[PDB]
Amino acid sequence: GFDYDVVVVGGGFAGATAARECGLQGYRTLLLEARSRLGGRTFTSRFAGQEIEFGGAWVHWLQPHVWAEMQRYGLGVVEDPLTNLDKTLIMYNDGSVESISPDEFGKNIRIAFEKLCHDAWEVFPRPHEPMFTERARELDKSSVLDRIKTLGLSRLQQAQINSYMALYAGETTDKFGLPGVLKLFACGGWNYDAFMDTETHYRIQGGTIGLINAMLTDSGAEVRMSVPVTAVEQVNGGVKIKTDDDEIITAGVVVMTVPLNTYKHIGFTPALSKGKQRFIKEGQLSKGAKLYVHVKQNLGRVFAFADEQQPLNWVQTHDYSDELGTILSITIARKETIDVNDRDAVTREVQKMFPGVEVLGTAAYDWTADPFSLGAWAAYGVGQLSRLKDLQAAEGRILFAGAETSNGWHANIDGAVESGLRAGREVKQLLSLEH
């Protein structure tokens, strides 16, 4: 006699997927989303007359769970075509900027990346079972920086790879676990060309929101937005879920899909396992934010890295023309290096990277300040990947999903989808008995 069979908390990819699995089994399913929008760490908006992506958007057929969903819903890819770069820049930690010939720039990053991931085959023969090998468990005592220091890289190569890794970390590279990066590279066919093809080449036709909506529509689930969950109590062979207006909703099972860094907001009765509590206390690393800048000048096709002590860590042309000028897409590794919502500070930093540009407008999303993310994409610290089963583990009638909890493409939309499929299976084991 519960209100619902299953409640899914969070309406990102993990929650949408889990709700779709549950709904198609015939379970009375409710999804609760804290924000007034669906999508979570995916969010498409508009700036300077154009569509922009504030969070995750890029996918690939080597990412199996999301690719299969795209087949199911009939969604093709939209290509962001790869072109000759007009300009490739590196800013070092001291703020000096160097223009590198684009062919040399690309050659150097490839050298550094392949050196960093040289043992991916040996360490991750089964990238979807990250602790299969004793070598992977041993490497989880190391940071990415520990490895970088042994590679014999040139000054340019070291700055490039450190910038790239600080981006993946959303943090300084001394804090970033090594195995997580190797595992991702392994997921991409243990090959630089294939892996790199997964990063910013393809989006989904109709967008991420189209796929979220297709899954929720398919699910038949009830969906409530602007309803943050503040507590879960296990009681009467089910759960009592408390919302921020103090409404109580009862269910047989609850699937938590909220980002790991937001678990501090939620009371649990009884207490979660010690291992899970440890994860909730540490969180995941990333402190990233996303920024778009509209510049009067036509800069053409540009790319820049900035190393970790600087704010504009990844810069790419989103669009350009004589009429438009240039829209720059920028990813900030660490919120503390810049306030993306302070237009003067942004302008000064952009001008340091590109002397002579006039800034016409900015749009930003500070994922690290948003109470319903408190961080960006999933990134593991030293020693975390080894303990991941503690985060995955069911806690009675509370199940756990989200990209952080996936085994494969954990920094991605795909990992979220993966975790939702797992959650649906775990719900089915609790509700649909073998008889």
Place this chain on the structure above:
Amino acid sequence: GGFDYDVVVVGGGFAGATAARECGLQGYRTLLLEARSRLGGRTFTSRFAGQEIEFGGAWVHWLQPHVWAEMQRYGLGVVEDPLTNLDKTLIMYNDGSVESISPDEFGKNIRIAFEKLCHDAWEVFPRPHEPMFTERARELDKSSVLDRIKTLGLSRLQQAQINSYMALYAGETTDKFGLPGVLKLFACGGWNYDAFMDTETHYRIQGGTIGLINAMLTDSGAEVRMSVPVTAVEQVNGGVKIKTDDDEIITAGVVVMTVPLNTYKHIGFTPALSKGKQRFIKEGQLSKGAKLYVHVKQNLGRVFAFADEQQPLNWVQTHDYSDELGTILSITIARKETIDVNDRDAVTREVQKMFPGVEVLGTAAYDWTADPFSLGAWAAYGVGQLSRLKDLQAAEGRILFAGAETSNGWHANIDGAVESGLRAGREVKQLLSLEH
């Protein structure tokens, strides 16, 4: 429209099981009709010499996205056939001479030949799931695999190796085998030899292929009938009438055909299928393969052999060995016409030619090419076929088409069958579940 079922799925291989699961979970009243007295189709697990053997498809990989996602859904891990040092690697040339090659050199040479064959896969197939995306792919579809092989400047050993390998993929001689199909598969495997090779015979599914088929059908809620071949489909009264071989008529809103392309001759269609689809049905797909296991008294250890296309034992691998057992060999025959796998004397003589001094204790075989419900083996495209694939995929009113042959990606695989089932489910939903 008062039909017996909302949807009928014809065939209980991976494509049909997938399509039935997609339809069943939408709440459609779903029926699956399977001709054989078993499910699985071109996957079939059996037993020989005290052990489990695979007579058809069985090996999978996480680079194969549709099947991998299903394995996540149903909680199925992998079972590894471990890679070991090979004790022997042999090549048999077309004239029947056998050379034992150092395993390190044997592996080096096949890599050289394969990489040379697939050198342009990045350029030709930037989007392996959209095979006709590039003009170059459409141009290459005028060429056979052999046309390319002749231009590669391979050594005698390399040429025999790669020709044996390609004859296996073709289930035919390499002069008939379309080039783009092979390049596309390589592209699907991360455009990389090591990744692609890992997909071939490394991992099986925990609980077997039949466990996955059963998990999907159980999940579906669909009614399943075995030993019911369909002999005709007539579109009529806003739906279809399906005729079985006992002349029973079953009505439905929609039907999904998942039977192998080479078996379409057995089925009458009203109205007639499109000219494009008729052309495919007339040509069929290439493969004329069979599967064979041989139990040998001697312990041969871990062995591998290629035989070129004029010989019968084209792919040989140790399935198991020990002093007590002797050896069980797993053998794939590219073309039925080169040997009768069900004639034990002939098999024995061919095995002894490859391994002089062995005593054959028993054999088990499955002649896919003779089975009326496959009439061929794995999907393989002839010259110019890949270019026209949309004609085979295209819905014909309320009859939808699926099966591995009709997939865009891993067409020679379980994964392609799954892919085609997901598509069919979507097409069913568009016909049945209206926008209002």
